[PDB]
Amino acid sequence: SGIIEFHVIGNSLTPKANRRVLLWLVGLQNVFSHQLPRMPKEYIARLVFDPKHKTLALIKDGRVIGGICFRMFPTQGFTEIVFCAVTSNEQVKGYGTHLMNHLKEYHIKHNILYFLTYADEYAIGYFKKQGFSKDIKVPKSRYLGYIKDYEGATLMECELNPRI
Numbered sequence: 001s002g003i004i005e006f007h008v009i010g011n012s013l014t015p016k017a018n019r020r021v022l023l024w025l026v027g028l029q030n031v032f033s034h035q036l037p038r039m040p041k042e043y044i045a046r047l048v049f050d051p052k053h054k055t056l057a058l059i060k061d062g063r064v065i066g067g068i069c070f071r072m073f074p075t076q077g078f079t080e081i082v083f084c085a086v087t088s089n090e091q092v093k094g095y096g097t098h099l100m101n102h103l104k105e106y107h108i109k110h111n112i113l114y115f116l117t118y119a120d121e122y123a124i125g126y127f128k129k130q131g132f133s134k135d136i137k138v139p140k141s142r143y144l145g146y147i148k149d150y151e152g153a154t155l156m157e158c159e160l161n162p163r164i
């Protein structure tokens, strides 16, 4: 291959069926754990391997270099962004943005035009660059008890424009 690849992966029932995917999920778990050191490792493991969660993985030379773990709520009309990370040495090259753009294109194709996420204070500017806002248009009745809340984090929303 020799080039970056985007793979939407996860655990559909059991992770043993596809070893390549398993290895990538472990890779993701490790990247998320390293780049989100305040999240418990067991918690990251649990969600990455949860059948209702998918992860858009960025793979370079068979190695996970970043990912966005998410959960789609089609009937609610949004997706929850759960974890978002690029490995350290590959940061500040445009990959965090590429990832999010890819994720947006994927969701436009699935007619889900809202992302919700809880952002750490020191990550807010990243989300803002990706078009997220603190102003939430998804009604609280729609996301309360659907999305996971976090301590001291700021709820942010991206309204996707499918046009162009």
Ligand SMILES: CCC(=O)SCCNC(=O)CCNC(=O)[C@H](O)C(C)(C)COP(=O)(O)OP(=O)(O)OC[C@H]1O[C@@H](n2cnc3c(N)ncnc32)[C@H](O)[C@@H]1OP(=O)(O)O
Pocket (backbone or CB within 6 Å): 035, 036, 081, 082, 083, 084, 085, 086, 087, 090, 091, 092, 093, 094, 095, 096, 097, 098, 117, 118, 119, 120, 122, 123, 124, 125, 126, 127, 129
């Ligand atoms: C909501 C769920 C969560 O995970 S909350 C926390 C978000 N994730 C993390 O904090 C994990 C640790 N951080 C990272 O992995 C990376 O810093 C992330 C956020 C993924 C960005 O990856 P990276 O590959 O460097 O992205 P990039 O090259 O496309 O550049 C990012 C562009 O956004 C801008 N930005 C503005 N404010 C911030 C900020 N507070 N942190 C990071 N980036 C920020 C950058 O300046 C950059 O824009 P530009 O290229 O200068 O125009």
